Amino acid sequence: VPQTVAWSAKTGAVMVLSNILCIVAGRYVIQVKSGSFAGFGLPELLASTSLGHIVGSGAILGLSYVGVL
Amino acid sequence: VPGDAGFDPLTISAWLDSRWLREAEIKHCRVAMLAAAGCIAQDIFQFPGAKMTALHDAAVKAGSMGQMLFWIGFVEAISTAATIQMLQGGRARMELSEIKNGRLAMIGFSGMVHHYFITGKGPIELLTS
Amino acid sequence: KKVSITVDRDPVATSFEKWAQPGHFSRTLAKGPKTTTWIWNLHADVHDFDSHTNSLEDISRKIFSAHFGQLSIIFLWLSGMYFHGARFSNYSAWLSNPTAVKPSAQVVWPIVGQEVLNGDVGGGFQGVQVTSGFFQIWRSSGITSEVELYWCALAGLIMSGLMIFAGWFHYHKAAPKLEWFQNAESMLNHHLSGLLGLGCLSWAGHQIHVSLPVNKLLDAGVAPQEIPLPHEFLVNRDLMAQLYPSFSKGLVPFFTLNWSEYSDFLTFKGGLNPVTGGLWLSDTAHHHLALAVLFIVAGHMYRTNWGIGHSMKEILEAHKGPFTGEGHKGLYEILTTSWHAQLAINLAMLGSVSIIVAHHMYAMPPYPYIATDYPTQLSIFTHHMWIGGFCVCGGAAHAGIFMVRDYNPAQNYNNLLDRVIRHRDAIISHLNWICIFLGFHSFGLYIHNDTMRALGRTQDMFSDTAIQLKPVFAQWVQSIHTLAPGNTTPNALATASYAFGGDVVAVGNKVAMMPISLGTADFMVHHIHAFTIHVTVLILLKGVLFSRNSRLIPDKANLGFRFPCDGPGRGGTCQSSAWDSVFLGLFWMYNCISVVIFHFSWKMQSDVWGTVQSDGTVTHITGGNFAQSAITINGWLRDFLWAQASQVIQSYGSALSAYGLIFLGAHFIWAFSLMFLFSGRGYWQELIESIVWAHNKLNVAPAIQPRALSITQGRAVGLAHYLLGGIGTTWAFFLARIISVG
Amino acid sequence: DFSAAVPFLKRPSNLDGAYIGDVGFDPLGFSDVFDLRVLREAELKHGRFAMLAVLGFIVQELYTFPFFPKMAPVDAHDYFVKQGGGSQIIFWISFVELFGVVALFETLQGKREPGDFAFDPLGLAKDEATLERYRLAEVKHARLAMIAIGGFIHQYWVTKQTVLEQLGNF
Amino acid sequence: MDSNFLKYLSTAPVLFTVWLSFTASFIIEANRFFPDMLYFPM
Ligand code: CLA
Ligand code: CLA
Ligand code: CLA
Ligand code: CLA
Ligand SMILES: CC1=C(C#C/C(C)=C/C=C/C(C)=C/C=C/C=C(C)/C=C/C=C(\C)C#CC2=C(C)C[C@@H](O)CC2(C)C)C(C)(C)C[C@H](O)C1
Ligand SMILES: CC1=C(C#C/C(C)=C/C=C/C(C)=C/C=C/C=C(C)/C=C/C=C(C)/C=C/C2=C(C)CCCC2(C)C)C(C)(C)C[C@H](O)C1
Ligand SMILES: CC1=C(C/C=C(\C)CCC[C@H](C)CCC[C@H](C)CCCC(C)C)C(=O)c2ccccc2C1=O
């Protein structure tokens, strides 16, 4: 079974990074909507952080799998 | 319009009905008012024959919470008719007092419950110790 | 918010007046009958909504409410399946002895000696043995009592009433507008996320909290009435943590991303449960939980009301290269303005999925004790192959109805449809050549073998013993899947299916599954399959591609989708319509699926099913005769049809005498169909004239003048009785054979 | 306008004081969908059954006929299922309900009030005013007895004591 | 009863289904009470 670890600040770090990464990506790649202060609303923010919890969950599970944690 | 401190930082009001938001907030206010006052009330005095979070499951086995659920469920059905008919179409101080004390009750109840997780105790019981 | 709900209120009046006026829905039929053709034309065109109405809005409204009516019938059907299980079944006796009791949920009344059909199915019970696999579903669900089967029956009835109310309500009280139905992004978002995603997630929750604890206790051996009720697992988390200790930690491992804690009940075992011969339900729970996540993820792809998402029009119009002209431009407009184009896709996909279901369920048996219930394994494979084949032919039926009616060349200039129609001779000539090659090099190998075996030349045959046509690619794929556990699926413990290789799984001394070896006979019959599927594609594709026009008839679209001919000229244009290729392609579908289920039936009996005893050796039902006898036609005639028809012919006087009667009755219906297929309308009208004369002689002629059936209806009646007869013969033959021996 | 009973619920609009006993209580909006004449026929039929049932309980504990065994009313249901008098009552009720089906067709066809069977043998209803008050009282009693019925049968199940003996004890 | 609903029940398929179900039904009942009648008893 792929090893997973109990929540630590390291798990938080990956999640925070991934959420911010997607918030910046969402400002760039969301085609229909002051780098983050133009046209930024809740559906844009709620979508980029939804992909952050998808990317972050995948990254956390993968880094636990290989040993990086 | 009541209790407007210009505080909608995330701008939820832009993407959900203000009537729906106000109804949900005032319902949350009144539920948390009852819950917080009840949480302090249990430690002040006890009804005959009858602590914060595990007492939910101490009460469900009797059928108390199930009965309360049935009556809240009934009232909430007529109240869902109420909110649908709201949505499909010297006192202002008192409304603002209700909403302010209700937001305070939400903070207070959250505090008491997470205090229970910390210490396994009710609010004023911990306050005393 | 351009995605919005819009409804016309009180559109159509709930009146019985049009009930009393048969044919009210069309201008031709509403003026009443003058010949008997009117009666047949009434039933033929009734659900052809786009033939009655011009507006896409009223057509969409009729379809939406008719889908509720269909749901109401399915819920009523499901509710009755539960009630017969609750009231007229040996389910409770079967729960104690799944390997000894035969499932039975139908009891006949004693009237004309027909109570012989209440055979001794076991458990102190008499009834008709049922093969639909409901008992195995209910045990997989964790039902464990007839009381819970009554509650499921009521749950179906309440749903059945709610669907028929909604169909009435959404046609007569609150009918959505066309702009509501034309929300393809919204509908896909909800049907991926809401229907399929929350469907899987909720079912995973039932599996985890009810199916997993109840079935662990059953497979441990606890008696069904000794098992705690399904809600005591929901409340007493200590009792659930006894069976699965990961429940001691609750939902903190889920939220903190420490998912490995849940490996007690979310496994990736693979293979089968040794006790029941079924899939590990801890695997099915993880399967449905994982499927649920990516259906909820998939349902966030399309743009509805907040700028995030894809426009499906933009995706399609962007995919165009140097070979394909304007590309997928105009396909969005087709699929949001034509119901037939949507029905053509969805029928072909649903038929394909039903064919996949047949293959996946025999090979990876999902339910407890369904693998060693061989009447069920044969029944649900055969049933889902026929549903698939029928639905696939209706996909080409409605691709033809689209092309004849809903296709507009002005909106389809130089796109993928325009380009397909403009080289359809190259497509149909290449498919035609493949089908000739395939027929010669698949069925001609059988004819070579018939001749060589008849001539005494067994060294000259294509056989495992003689010249060998081995399926090396299928054997190699089988090798890879047995090597996959621990190698290319490292955390899997067993193979996806034991059909690929590996152990023999035995339940109650009967084989659940065991490796299905492939030899020359398997090479031969697989190319038989590729030939029959390609010809079926050939007949149906030629009908779709030539539906509007040919070199023969330059204006076939003006005659319609369904016309009998365009006269005896040009040498003769009989059966030139797109309807007439669906008619001819349902015969070749029948031919195709008949060989598939015959291949399945003989191979499973000969090489898979049977009994295990000391030394672990398996005695198969027909003793491994497939390898050396499925290579000749005489082997299929003798060792499959003749040898296995013994049970249905000798069934008289037993509980299987019903199958013996349906065997003969379907042979009758099939032959009777050839009266309609080989004959023509002109003979039958002239025969009717003399019969009309004798009525005129007695002053008893009818005022609705009798006619011979139309040319099309003679074809439709002939095909329907051919299918009813052909399939009904195999149904009786399959069911009496496998109930007796398996 | 707003509902008389529920102040914050709007009036249903198919309930415009046409029937006696109308307080505007219809949250589910069954009167926006279904015929109110049919619903009122059912209301009065369910209520009249409930009224005869509650009295049926009370008298059956106080007295029972000498030719029938003494026992509790739910036990009476099961005893008369197996004895034969239950089918008697079912047959004669069903017989009357045939002419009730004709009566409901007469109501749908506009020619009859929903619960009116012209059953005034003792001439108790005198004129329009006393008849309106009597039918308001009938509706109120019918609804109340429907509630009451649930209580007697359900309470007997939970505690195996009859309604009068349950008031007498505890 | 509604005259359009009675005109619907007078339609040929309903009457055909009802009459032949009624006809089938008293053959079934006659063979329940009086079974195995190969001959007119005389
Ligand atoms: C939907 C699928 C389905 C199917 C195929 C069956 C099939 C069967 N049921 Mg089951 N049943 C179902 C659902 C189903 N049932 C449901 C949902 C319930 C719960 C209410 C039941 C409850 C039930 C019981 C309680 C019994 C059966 C029995 C039977 C058997 C005999 C039925 C019979 O001859 O009665 C015939 C009854 C008649 C009144 C004959 C009616 C014939 C008319 C003329 C049909 C006409 C339809 C009409 C013309 C449509 C148009 C309407 C009009 C306005 C024009 C048969 C195996 C019996 C059995 O198994 O006995 C051992 C039995 O006792 N069923
Ligand atoms: C989450 C939202 C959602 C869900 C679940 C569905 C579900 C369905 N739609 Mg869709 N639909 C949706 C949104 C949704 N729709 C939206 C937003 C639109 C507008 C664009 C449409 C437009 C649309 C059309 C035009 C059609 C459908 C049809 C269907 C049915 C497909 C046949 C089938 O598999 O039914 C069987 C499967 C089932 C699960 C039966 C379930 C019955 C209920 C309705 C499901 C939901 C119940 C409830 C939410 C669950 C409560 C859970 C609670 C106990 C905790 C199915 C019931 C077709 C149909 O059959 O019409 C009736 C059809 O023609 N839908
Ligand atoms: C989701 C599935 C689906 C849907 C909604 C439709 C809907 C439609 N189809 Mg399509 N079709 C489908 C599946 C579907 N079909 C499949 C699977 C096939 C392959 C066989 C076809 C082949 C097909 C053709 C070839 C034609 C249609 C036509 C039609 C239309 C007219 C329907 C009508 O009036 O018939 C009324 C219904 C009947 C007359 C029912 C009688 C049919 C059979 C003979 C009776 C059933 C036998 C029964 C199951 C077993 C009896 C038991 C026995 C022992 C007694 C309508 C748009 C026609 C059209 O012109 O469309 C524009 C048309 O010509 N369809
Ligand atoms: C046993 C009955 C039978 C046979 C042999 C055929 C044969 C054929 N059909 Mg027909 N068909 C049949 C019944 C049959 N059909 C029925 C009942 C229907 C009713 C719906 C149809 C409807 C139908 C349609 C609608 C279509 C076909 C097509 C085909 C061809 C498939 C291509 C192929 O396999 O070429 C290989 C040829 C064979 C397998 C024939 C047997 C040859 C074997 C190998 C022995 C050859 C011996 C050799 C020539 C001897 C030479 C010496 C000798 C002269 C002395 C082929 C000509 C399709 C077609 O023509 O497209 C290609 C097509 O579109 N058929
Ligand atoms: C119309 C007509 C005529 C007639 C007639 C007839 C037969 C008229 C009969 C009318 C009847 C029987 C009316 C009865 C109403 C009963 C009600 C409202 C229920 C009350 C119970 C309650 C509140 C309770 C309770 C409780 C619960 C549930 C459980 C307990 O543990 C506790 C507790 C006890 C508190 C005649 C023939 C005269 C002629 C005339 O020309 C026309
Ligand atoms: C099955 C069977 C049997 C049986 C039986 C029977 C008949 C059992 C009885 C079933 C019945 C009548 C249940 C109904 C109960 C009434 C309810 C719940 C209303 C509550 C009012 C509410 C919730 C609110 C009211 C409201 C509040 C807040 C205050 C304002 C007003 C209002 C808005 C109205 C037998 C005996 C025949 C035996 C046989 O062998 C088996
Ligand atoms: C026999 C025959 C007829 C004569 C058949 C007719 C006129 C129909 C006779 C059907 C009778 C009148 C009613 C059918 C009732 C059946 C006993 C049951 C049928 C089941 C459903 C229709 C209910 C044709 O008209 C015909 C036309 C074109 C090609 C072949 C043929 C053909 O073979």
TrEMBL record, chain A:
Keywords, ordered alphabetically: Chloroplast, Membrane, Photosynthesis, Photosystem I, Plastid, Thylakoid, Transmembrane, Transmembrane helix
Keyword Hydrolase: no
Domain of life: Eukaryota
PROSITE patterns: PHOTOSYSTEM_I_PSAGK (PS01026)
Membrane topology recorded in Swiss-Prot or TrEMBL: Multi-pass membrane protein
Any GO BP: photosynthesis
Keyword ATP-binding applies: no
Subcellular localization: Membrane; Plastid, Chloroplast thylakoid membrane
Short name of one Pfam family: PSI_PSAK
Gene3D superfamilies: Photosystem I PsaK, reaction centre (1.20.860.20)
List of residues binding chlorophyll a: 7, 53
SUPFAM superfamilies (alphabetical): Photosystem I reaction center subunit X, PsaK (SSF81563)
Record-annotated membrane-spanning stretches: 11-30
GO CC, alphabetical: chloroplast thylakoid membrane; photosystem I
NCBIfam families assigned to the protein according to its UniProt record, in alphabetical order: PS_I_psaK (TIGR03049)
UniProt similarity note: Belongs to the PsaG/PsaK family.
Protein name in UniProt: Photosystem I reaction center subunit PsaK
Species, as recorded: Rhodomonas salina
TrEMBL record, chain C:
Binding-site residues, chlorophyll a 34: 534
Binding-site residues, chlorophyll a 20: 287, 360
Annotated binding of chlorophyll a A3, by residue: 675, 683
Positions with a binding annotation for chlorophyll a 37: 695
Residues reported to bind chlorophyll a 36: 675, 683
Residues annotated to bind chlorophyll a 32: 481, 488-489
Binding of chlorophyll a 25, residues: 367, 383-384
Residues reported to bind chlorophyll a 6: 67, 346
Binding-site residues, chlorophyll a 9: 106, 109, 114
Class of the enzyme per the UniProt entry, highest EC level: oxidoreductase
Binding residue positions for chlorophyll a 14: 189, 300, 304
Membrane spanning residue stretches: 63-83, 149-171, 343-363, 383-405, 426-447, 523-541, 582-602, 656-678, 719-739
Amino acids binding chlorophyll a 16: 206
Protein name: Photosystem I P700 chlorophyll a apoprotein A1
Species of the source: Rhodomonas salina
